[PDB]
Amino acid sequence: NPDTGQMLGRTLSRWVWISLYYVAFYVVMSGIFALCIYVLMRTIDPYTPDYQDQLKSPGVTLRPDVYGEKGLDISYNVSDSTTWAGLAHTLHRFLAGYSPAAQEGSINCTSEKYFFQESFLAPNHTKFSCKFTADMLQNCSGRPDPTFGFAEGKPCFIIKMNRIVKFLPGNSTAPRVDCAFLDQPRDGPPLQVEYFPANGTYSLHYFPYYGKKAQPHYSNPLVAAKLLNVPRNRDVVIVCKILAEHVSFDNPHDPYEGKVEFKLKIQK
Amino acid sequence: NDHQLSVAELEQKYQTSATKGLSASLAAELLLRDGPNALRPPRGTPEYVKFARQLAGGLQCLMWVAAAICLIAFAIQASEGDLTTDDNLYLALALIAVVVVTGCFGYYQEFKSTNIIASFKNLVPQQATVIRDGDKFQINADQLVVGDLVEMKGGDRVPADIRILQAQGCKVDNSSLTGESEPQTRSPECTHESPLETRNIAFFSTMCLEGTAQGLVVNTGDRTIIGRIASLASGVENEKTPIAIEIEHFVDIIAGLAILFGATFFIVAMCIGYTFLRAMVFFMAIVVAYVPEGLLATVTVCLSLTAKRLASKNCVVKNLEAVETLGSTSVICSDKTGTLTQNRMTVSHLWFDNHIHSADTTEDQSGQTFDQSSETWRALCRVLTLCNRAAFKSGQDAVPVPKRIVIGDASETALLKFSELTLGNAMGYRERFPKVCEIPFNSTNKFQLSIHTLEDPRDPRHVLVMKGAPERVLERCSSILIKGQELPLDEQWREAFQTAYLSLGGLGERVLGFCQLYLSEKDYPPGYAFDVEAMNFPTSGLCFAGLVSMIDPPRATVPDAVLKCRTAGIRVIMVTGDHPITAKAIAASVGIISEGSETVEDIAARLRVPVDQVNRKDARACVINGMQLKDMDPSELVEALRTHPEMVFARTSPQQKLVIVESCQRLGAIVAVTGDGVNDSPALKKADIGVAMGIAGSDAAKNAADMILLDDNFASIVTGVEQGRLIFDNLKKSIAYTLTKNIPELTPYLIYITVSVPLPLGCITILFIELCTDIFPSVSLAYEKAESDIMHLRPRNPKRDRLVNEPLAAYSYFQIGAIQSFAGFTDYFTAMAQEGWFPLLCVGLRPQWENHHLQDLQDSYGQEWTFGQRLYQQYTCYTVFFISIEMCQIADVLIRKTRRLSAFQQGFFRNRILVIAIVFQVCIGCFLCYCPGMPNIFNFMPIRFQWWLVPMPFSLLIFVYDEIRKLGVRCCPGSWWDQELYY
Numbered sequence A: 001n002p003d004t005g006q007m008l009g010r011t012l013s014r015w016v017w018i019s020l021y022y023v024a025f026y027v028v029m030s031g032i033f034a035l036c037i038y039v040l041m042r043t044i045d046p047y048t049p050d051y052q053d054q055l056k057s058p059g060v061t062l063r064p065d066v067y068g069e070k071g072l073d074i075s076y077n078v079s080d081s082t083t084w085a086g087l088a089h090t091l092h093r094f095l096a097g098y099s100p101a102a103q104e105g106s107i108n109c110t111s112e113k114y115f116f117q118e119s120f121l122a123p124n125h126t127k128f129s130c131k132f133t134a135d136m137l138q139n140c141s142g143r144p145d146p147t148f149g150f151a152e153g154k155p156c157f158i159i160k161m162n163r164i165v166k167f168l169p170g171n172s173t174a175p176r177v178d179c180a181f182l183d184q185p186r187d188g189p190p191l192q193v194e195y196f197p198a199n200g201t202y203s204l205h206y207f208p209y210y211g212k213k214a215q216p217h218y219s220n221p222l223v224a225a226k227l228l229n230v231p232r233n234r235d236v237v238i239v240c241k242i243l244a245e246h247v248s249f250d251n252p253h254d255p256y257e258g259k260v261e262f263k264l265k266i267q268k
Numbered sequence B: 001n002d003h004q005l006s007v008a009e010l011e012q013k014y015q016t017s018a019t020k021g022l023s024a025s026l027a028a029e030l031l032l033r034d035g036p037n038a039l040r041p042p043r044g045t046p047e048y049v050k051f052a053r054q055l056a057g058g059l060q061c062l063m064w065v066a067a068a069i070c071l072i073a074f075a076i077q078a079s080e081g082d083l084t085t086d087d088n089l090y091l092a093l094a095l096i097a098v099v100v101v102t103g104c105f106g107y108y109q110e111f112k113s114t115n116i117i118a119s120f121k122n123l124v125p126q127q128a129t130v131i132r133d134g135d136k137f138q139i140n141a142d143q144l145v146v147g148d149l150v151e152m153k154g155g156d157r158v159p160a161d162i163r164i165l166q167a168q169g170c171k172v173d174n175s176s177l178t179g180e181s182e183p184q185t186r187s188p189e190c191t192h193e194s195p196l197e198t199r200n201i202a203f204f205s206t207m208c209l210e211g212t213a214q215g216l217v218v219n220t221g222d223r224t225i226i227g228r229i230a231s232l233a234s235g236v237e238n239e240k241t242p243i244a245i246e247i248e249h250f251v252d253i254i255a256g257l258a259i260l261f262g263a264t265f266f267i268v269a270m271c272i273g274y275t276f277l278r279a280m281v282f283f284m285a286i287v288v289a290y291v292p293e294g295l296l297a298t299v300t301v302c303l304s305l306t307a308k309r310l311a312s313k314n315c316v317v318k319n320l321e322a323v324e325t326l327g328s329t330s331v332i333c334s335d336k337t338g339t340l341t342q343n344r345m346t347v348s349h350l351w352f353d354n355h356i357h358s359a360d361t362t363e364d365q366s367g368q369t370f371d372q373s374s375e376t377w378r379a380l381c382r383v384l385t386l387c388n389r390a391a392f393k394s395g396q397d398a399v400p401v402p403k404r405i406v407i408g409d410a411s412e413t414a415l416l417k418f419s420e421l422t423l424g425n426a427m428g429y430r431e432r433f434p435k436v437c438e439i440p441f442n443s444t445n446k447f448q449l450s451i452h453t454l455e456d457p458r459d460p461r462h463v464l465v466m467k468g469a470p471e472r473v474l475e476r477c478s479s480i481l482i483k484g485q486e487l488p489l490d491e492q493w494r495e496a497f498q499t500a501y502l503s504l505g506g507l508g509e510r511v512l513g514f515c516q517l518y519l520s521e522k523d524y525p526p527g528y529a530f531d532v533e534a535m536n537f538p539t540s541g542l543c544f545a546g547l548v549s550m551i552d553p554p555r556a557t558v559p560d561a562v563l564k565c566r567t568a569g570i571r572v573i574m575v576t577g578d579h580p581i582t583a584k585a586i587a588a589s590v591g592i593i594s595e596g597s598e599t600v601e602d603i604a605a606r607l608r609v610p611v612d613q614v615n616r617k618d619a620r621a622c623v624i625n626g627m628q629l630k631d632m633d634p635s636e637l638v639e640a641l642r643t644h645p646e647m648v649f650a651r652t653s654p655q656q657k658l659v660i661v662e663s664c665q666r667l668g669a670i671v672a673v674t675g676d677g678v679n680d681s682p683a684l685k686k687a688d689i690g691v692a693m694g695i696a697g698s699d700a701a702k703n704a705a706d707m708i709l710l711d712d713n714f715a716s717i718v719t720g721v722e723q724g725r726l727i728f729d730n731l732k733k734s735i736a737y738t739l740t741k742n743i744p745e746l747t748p749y750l751i752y753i754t755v756s757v758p759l760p761l762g763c764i765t766i767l768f769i770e771l772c773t774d775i776f777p778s779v780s781l782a783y784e785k786a787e788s789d790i791m792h793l794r795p796r797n798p799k800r801d802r803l804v805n806e807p808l809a810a811y812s813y814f815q816i817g818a819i820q821s822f823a824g825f826t827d828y829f830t831a832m833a834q835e836g837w838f839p840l841l842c843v844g845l846r847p848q849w850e851n852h853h854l855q856d857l858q859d860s861y862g863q864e865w866t867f868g869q870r871l872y873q874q875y876t877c878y879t880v881f882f883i884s885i886e887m888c889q890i891a892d893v894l895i896r897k898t899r900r901l902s903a904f905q906q907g908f909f910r911n912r913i914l915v916i917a918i919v920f921q922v923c924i925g926c927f928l929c930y931c932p933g934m935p936n937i938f939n940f941m942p943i944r945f946q947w948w949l950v951p952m953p954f955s956l957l958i959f960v961y962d963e964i965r966k967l968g969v970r971c972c973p974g975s976w977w978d979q980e981l982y983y
């Protein structure tokens, strides 16, 4: 089939024309595709997504995040500092973005209700964002305890709610974190948690979130849950859910929607 | 051999006697050396073997290889802790299931065809008659041994191959074993050199029509002529069908493209930074992706629909691949006796009133009748009606006269049926003229005579009717009846009679002379003592009434079928075991030899030159008999076939029929063979398509054939040719439609691997596209009408016109499929960006997107997403890509209705099956999108309405582009556009 006069059943001149035809066809098709993408991006709104079909209730994440086989799994040894050194280092890295130096781009908020901004009055055509510093987490903030309670068997877990543009948790009361055992160890009591900030709430002036273009300095409000009666040398499952009117935690196809569930083991 | 052997040289070879016969002990001990006198049953394929063969084929093997590659890739991925390994299992299961279900469908088609064919297979044990040690006792035919002395009488099957020792008026029906349409006289004198044409050999399978005979068993079981034909047919190998060859070529194209794309993107993956194992898995995925899952089912369903359409015309195929061979056929090698003709002697021509008349020979009387308004005709009708001893069976009024059954001679049967058709109530007319004397057709007199009494009670004369050979009635018959007058012979009427007899004999017909004599009452008063042994009545000085000739005539639809086949560009060759004169006359009658075409003998006779002095290229027709065919080598046979367009082979043995078929096939032609007898079973097996008559066909012929004509209608051949051409074109369209959607199924995976965007299209939705939503639209293209006069085109060139070729593949894959991929990706990016994921962020997003440990991945607006939410968004991408492919496939099915004509000319809605299939496709798309539970069952999402609208301009672009391409093809035939852009 490959021959000098006819190269795979087609002369060299005819190959040129057929290749030119295909090049022109694909150039035109690529131009149409690029024009379609350009039109789409010019109809896209810079600040608000067109639809939030997959974002009905926010997800909930936990720090420090260590994943085992089926999900979050934290296990360490009080007698061995190398078991929780990495956990405390992860917490320190996470709270690095919550120092006042990191928060200089946000403002003080004392409203305790929705920060409803209809105009752009922060600099560079921007909306204001409230400060969350790693001092509102008091004891679990990393000072004066750089171990976050891990050394003394009372670890602090930071619970963060996923941010959704214009989502409102509910203004009857501030959304609140509640942590408990999944199936309580029948030989012990219910989980004793004590939270930072007090009552484990996210202040309502961190909502609504207006997106990263309108609020480039926005920081998710944090709640630290210090567990005080976790049994030692035993596997426990902890579920931390968000108590808000517009937050749901009952989706069986997304275990992080509205709550966070982790396994915990503290050995001695 | 045994025919060329005296009884003295016999009777010692077989240790028998010509009268005493074999001893009862020698026969019993010879039945041990040689088995029972029966043919060996065929090999016999078990049903599981038949099903396993259905499970094979080019496309089936490609799918088996694809499933094996899927499983190997699954093992490789499982040796790496991969997650999305269920896709490999789903693909392998889908491929295996499609192969198995298609094999079950094909096996069921074979089983049903076998049931219908065997339904008309008649079964009955057979007896014989043997004289051992003097005792003439009746025995089963299978206890016969070589050397046995048997007796045959009219109506009995010949019990074995027999050298005739004594015979009295014995005639045999050899039309199934040989091509001889006329009954053959059997006499103990060795006439011809070969045993197949001698008169002292009777054959195992044949009928003794009349008389009695006695002879010696010379062959038994599988050593008989029919047994040796069965052995020859068993050694003939069944070659591949043209459609199977086309499918194999298309499989080669698929494999080449798959390997090319896989290697290219394996190199790309290696250069991008993928590990060698990952790049190999990518190569395997691409190779598997190029294999279409539903195409085997689509092709099988289209072939089955064509088979159903053919069966609606009493044309049953034994395999689904046989429905296209007639459309691809360029040469039809046809049998004469019983295939082109009715295998029944009927009255064809009459010479009375100095004019040759032509009778209606069609079995349904759909032809023209000669002028019956005369007095010579009435006299001839009376003579032929009264001088006949044949009689119809009692209880026959529904059956037409040609297909009734009568007890008597073949010639007497033809005369009786002719009388019943013309005069009507032949038996009643004959009984209304009482017969007082008669003389049977003895060999010495060579005529039949009878004296009757007239029907009116006032005419006391006696009418003497005599029928016999022309040059035995002409020695008598001093007078001749012309226009009712009794003009005498002036040697001019003798010249006219000789000319008419010579012409009728040269027409391959058997002529009979008829005459009457009105005996005077004065010399022969009523009550005259007529003595057959005294010759007291006048046997000379008769009045010749006319000449009647008989032939085995063609079937009613055969001439038109032959003309249509030749119009379609198919060469028709007659190959018969019958005599050359009859073969040539029938070939002229049916149109195999055209009007005005001559042989070299004809040209020599016209030019008064010797046969060796005529240019062979001047003769369009040719008649080659078997002895000449023996001497010719393949080179001379090829030269003769390529020199004479209208070829007739006469006195052809089954081996020589096989040789002719092999020569035609070796010249590169796809050859169809039509036959009914055992003598064309090897040729039917060797043919690309073998067609056997359902009613007239022998069991061996029907077993050898791929096609059975249940009603023995030859026009079903032209129906099959048209259906085969139509199915070829519609299969081309359906395969183009099926192949188009493969590229939009594969390009999302290529972009997923190379650009690392979240997976735009999943395995489950790909399987739904392949096996649920597009199978019905692809099948509906089998109902497309022809775009031109398909019956006036020439047969396709098998080496140049492939079912799937480069223009079709290139178009379907890289133009329409490219447009479909662009539509799918436009919809994908629209759905992504409107949910918060801009295209630039989508680029390179796959690791984070699929990371199960990332539950707050940020989108373009800074919103944080869990893995489950991202997975539901991915299912939305699946659904929008699926719907884009669906809409573009609606446009594709619209554009594949025609290859040259516009949709505005062929008709948008004239294919109601196609319209219903489009509605069905849309309905299933809607059901999959919007049925509750679909997101978690099949990963289909209830997409917003604008996701439906985005691919619609691309579908319209597909339609407009195809319309413009076909307009350019129509307006500029032979241009660069036609050569490159037409498929």
Ligand SMILES: CCCCCCCC/C=C/CCCCCCCC(=O)OC[C@H](COP(=O)(O)OCC[N+](C)(C)C)OC(=O)CCCCCCC/C=C/CCCCCCCC
Pocket (backbone or CB within 6 Å): B086, B090, B093, B094, B095, B097, B098, B101, B102, B294, B297, B298, B764, B767, B768, B771, B772, B775, B776, B779, B936, B937, B938
């Ligand atoms: C073409 C004519 C017929 C000729 C071929 C006949 C057989 C065709 C069938 C092929 C399928 C192969 C057999 C089934 C193989 C898969 C079995 C299976 O286990 O599958 C399950 C999946 C969905 O599982 P899940 O997510 O619920 O499991 C969740 C479990 N976890 C969590 C592990 C994911 O199901 C799926 O893959 C669905 C895959 C899509 C294919 C389904 C079959 C659709 C065929 C329709 C043809 C109808 C006739 C043609 C049209 C009529 C007009 C002519």
Ligand SMILES: CCCCCCCC/C=C\CCCCCCCC(=O)OC[C@H](COP(=O)(O)OCC[N+](C)(C)C)OC(=O)CCCCCCC/C=C/CCCCCCCC
Pocket (backbone or CB within 6 Å): A026, A030, A033, A034, A035, A037, A038, A041, A042, A044, A045, A046, B747, B751, B755, B817, B818, B819, B821, B822, B825, B838, B839, B840, B843
């Ligand atoms: C064999 C032939 C193959 C042909 C392949 C396709 C060739 C063309 C591919 C890329 C060319 C660029 C097309 C996109 C550019 C559109 C024009 C444009 O200027 O748009 C602007 C955007 C950036 O806007 P922004 O988001 O910053 O604005 C935000 C605005 N506010 C803030 C208001 C919301 O620029 C962009 O998006 C650039 C996006 C670049 C990456 C796109 C994703 C790559 C995926 C490609 C898959 C395509 C498969 C094709 C299958 C063919 C099979 C034969």
Ligand SMILES: CCCCCCCC/C=C\CCCCCCCC(=O)OC[C@H](COP(=O)(O)OCC[N+](C)(C)C)OC(=O)CCCCCCC/C=C\CCCCCCCC
Pocket (backbone or CB within 6 Å): A253, B872, B923, B924, B927, B931, B932, B933, B934, B935, B936, B937
């Ligand atoms: C061309 C026409 C073909 C017609 C086929 C024959 C007729 C059968 C069709 C329908 C009969 C069943 C109808 C559905 C049952 C009632 C509806 C229901 O019970 O809804 C309860 C809800 C539905 O959830 P949702 O709508 O909010 O969506 C979930 C959204 N996401 C993302 C958030 C999780 O809770 C749930 O999810 C649980 C729902 C569980 C699944 C329901 C059973 C139907 C699914 C499969 C049956 C077989 C279909 C496939 C047949 C072979 C292939 C063609």
Ligand SMILES: CCCCCCCC/C=C\CCCCCCCC(=O)O[C@H](COC(=O)CCCCCCC/C=C/CCCCCCCC)COP(=O)(O)OCC[N+](C)(C)C
Pocket (backbone or CB within 6 Å): A053, A054, B890, B918, B919, B922, B923, B926, B930, B941, B942, B943, B944, B945, B946, B948
């Ligand atoms: C050819 C003859 C065809 C006859 C009709 C075929 C069957 C149609 C029957 C029912 C379909 C309508 C009912 C289901 C949709 C509403 C359910 C729903 O709720 O869908 C909602 C969206 O709906 C809409 O935007 C508008 C409703 C209609 C959409 C298009 C319907 C498809 C129609 C196609 C016809 C195209 C004809 C032209 C092309 C062919 C030319 C030859 C889904 O909710 P979402 O996405 O907001 O949730 C997001 C939240 N997440 C994801 C968590 C669940």
Ligand SMILES: CC(C)CCC[C@@H](C)[C@H]1CC[C@H]2[C@@H]3CC=C4C[C@@H](O)CC[C@]4(C)[C@H]3CC[C@]12C
Pocket (backbone or CB within 6 Å): A015, A018, A019, A022, A023, B806, B807, B810
């Ligand atoms: C996309 C890039 C990397 C592909 C490589 C460039 C070259 C090799 C491509 C570009 C255009 C292509 C040609 C386009 C048109 C045809 C006509 C078709 O009937 C056979 C393939 C053929 C002849 C292609 C061969 C390969 C080709 C010449």
Ligand SMILES: CC(C)CCC[C@@H](C)[C@H]1CC[C@H]2[C@@H]3CC=C4C[C@@H](O)CC[C@]4(C)[C@H]3CC[C@]12C
Pocket (backbone or CB within 6 Å): A017, A020, A021, A022, A023, A024, A025, B976
């Ligand atoms: C140059 C830009 C616009 C892209 C390329 C356009 C292509 C599709 C056009 C431009 C020039 C055109 C070619 C010009 C020359 C010939 C040779 C002639 O006998 C047939 C048409 C043919 C074969 C044309 C085919 C199509 C063609 C190659």
Ligand SMILES: CNCC1=CC=C(OCC2=C(OCc3ccccc3)C=CCC2)CC1
Pocket (backbone or CB within 6 Å): B069, B070, B073, B074, B087, B088, B091, B281, B282, B284, B285, B286, B288, B289, B290, B291, B292, B293, B742, B745, B746, B749, B761, B762, B763, B766, B770
């Ligand atoms: C006739 N077209 C059918 C197909 C078109 C496109 C295909 O992409 C491959 C693909 C996947 O590969 C998985 C796979 C890997 C290795 C071997 C076989 C299969 C996975 C998800 C989506 C797509 C597969 C099948």
Ligand SMILES: *[C@@H]1O[C@H](CO)[C@@H](O)[C@H](O)[C@H]1NC(C)=O
Pocket (backbone or CB within 6 Å): A077, A079, A080, A233, A267, A268
């Ligand atoms: C780790 O915990 C175990 C009990 O599970 C304890 O015996 C050990 O002392 C601890 N680590 C060390 C090395 O101190």
Ligand SMILES: *[C@@H]1O[C@H](CO)[C@@H](O)[C@H](O)[C@H]1NC(C)=O
Pocket (backbone or CB within 6 Å): A100, A108
């Ligand atoms: C915000 O308010 C607190 C309490 O009034 C104050 O101590 C702090 O200085 C303010 N923010 C700054 C400037 O860090």
Ligand SMILES: *[C@@H]1O[C@H](CO)[C@@H](O)[C@H](O)[C@H]1NC(C)=O
Pocket (backbone or CB within 6 Å): A139, A194, A226
């Ligand atoms: C938090 O720290 C204070 C001292 O600053 C202490 O009194 C209090 O008990 C601590 N609470 C817990 C549970 O750590």
Ligand SMILES: [Mg+2]
Pocket (backbone or CB within 6 Å): B175, B176, B179, B335, B336, B337, B338, B339, B675, B676, B677
């Ligand atoms: Mg025959």
